[PDB]
Design a protein around this ligand. Structure first.
Ligand code: CA
Ligand code: CA
Ligand code: CL
Ligand code: CL
Ligand code: CL
Ligand code: CL
Ligand code: CL
Ligand code: CL
Ligand code: CL
Ligand code: CL
Ligand code: CL
Length: 123
């Protein structure tokens, strides 16, 4: 929110960070079962993105990066490749959040985890 991914979410969606860090079955810590909607699928993919970074030896949950937003889009930067990779995962997710604003549903914010059912899609 005052931190990097949160700041990117706010810039790209017009929403508060708090409206995406606990949404559906995947936005927020961990994730299981079937994503509730397209925005949730952005978070399923983002989780997979961090998994890939972790396997490369990065710590994406802790990496801090630099970025700007202009009209060509989101520009990523950071001293290290792991910082830039984390930015790239976040950028993809924030763009996915913006793309799917049309089906964002307030009822899925702070979704009770017990409501998550079905299989867990593979990465
Ligand atoms: Ca998650
Ligand atoms: Ca939720
Ligand atoms: Cl991704
Ligand atoms: Cl990879
Ligand atoms: Cl900026
Ligand atoms: Cl962009
Ligand atoms: Cl843009
Ligand atoms: Cl640094
Ligand atoms: Cl690195
Ligand atoms: Cl709504
Ligand atoms: Cl809203």
């Amino acid at each position: 929110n005052l931190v990097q991914f949160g700041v990117m979410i706010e810039k790209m969606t017009g929403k508060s960070a708090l409206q995406y860090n606990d949404y559906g079955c995947y936005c927020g810590i961990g994730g299981s079962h079937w994503p509730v909607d397209q925005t949730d699928w952005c978070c399923h993919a983002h989780d997979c993105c961090y998994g890939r970074l972790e396997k490369l030896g990065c710590e994406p949950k802790l990496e801090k990066y630099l970025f700007s937003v202009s009209e060509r889009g989101i520009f990523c930067a950071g001293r290290t490749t792991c910082q830039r990779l984390t930015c790239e995962c976040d950028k993809r997710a924030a763009l996915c959040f913006r793309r799917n604003l049309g089906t964002y549903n307030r009822k899925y914010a702070h979704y009770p985890n017990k409501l998550c059912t079905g299989p867990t899609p593979p990465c």
